[PDB]
Amino acid sequence: SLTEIEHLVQSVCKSYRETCQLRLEDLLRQRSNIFSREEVTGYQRKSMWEMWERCAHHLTEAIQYVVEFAKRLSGFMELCQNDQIVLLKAGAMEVVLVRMCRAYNADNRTVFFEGKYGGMELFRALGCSELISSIFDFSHSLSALHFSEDEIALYTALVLINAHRPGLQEKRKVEQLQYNLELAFHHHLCKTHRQSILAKLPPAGKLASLCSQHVERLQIFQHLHPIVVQAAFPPLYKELFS
């Protein structure tokens, strides 16, 4: 039923609006609040472990909103808890990375971070130049498409409800949920004359590559500073990534 598909569209968009962490208007209104060169230098002079700790904290809080987003997806809470965990462990960070495009300003290539907008040079103390640049590049691609709030809602639902995740017990059930969400997303694109973005969306594996890079860099950092991760990284971050 077209009515049932459109009810799903409304439900997913509402669930995202309730869990988007930051309203889009608040991010846009801060675009002229840009870090000075002295502030950028201050971030660059911070130790690697302190920059990692702060960034892991911000990622953990953002992941918490993704979990609430999942909990407001009716089909997601119908899955068994094993599959809920599998989907969240595999997809929560991917959802965060997609959500980051709202905090990215394509006009000057800056991202909102700790109250102001800064370029990727702000994150040099992490030692993750490739990861950070790829995140900027990914956010720039979605920003160039003017990815709407409703499109982000439906797309991030599909990022999470991925029936190809290894470890799923009720694979057929996730397949049905994924197909209904695909119909909802594509119906919304058709109704809004936005189907031209289908070929312009980032390819399959690009999001996985970003998540793999994050885990790989964390693996390196944890080898270098195991006590810092143990003593100062958020427990949810460690449960998800280490």
Binding site: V67, K71, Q84, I85, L88, L236, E239
Partner: peptide, 9 residues
Amino acid sequence: KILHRLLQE
């Protein structure tokens, strides 16, 4: 563990 608790809240 934590995801378990978050999903039940």
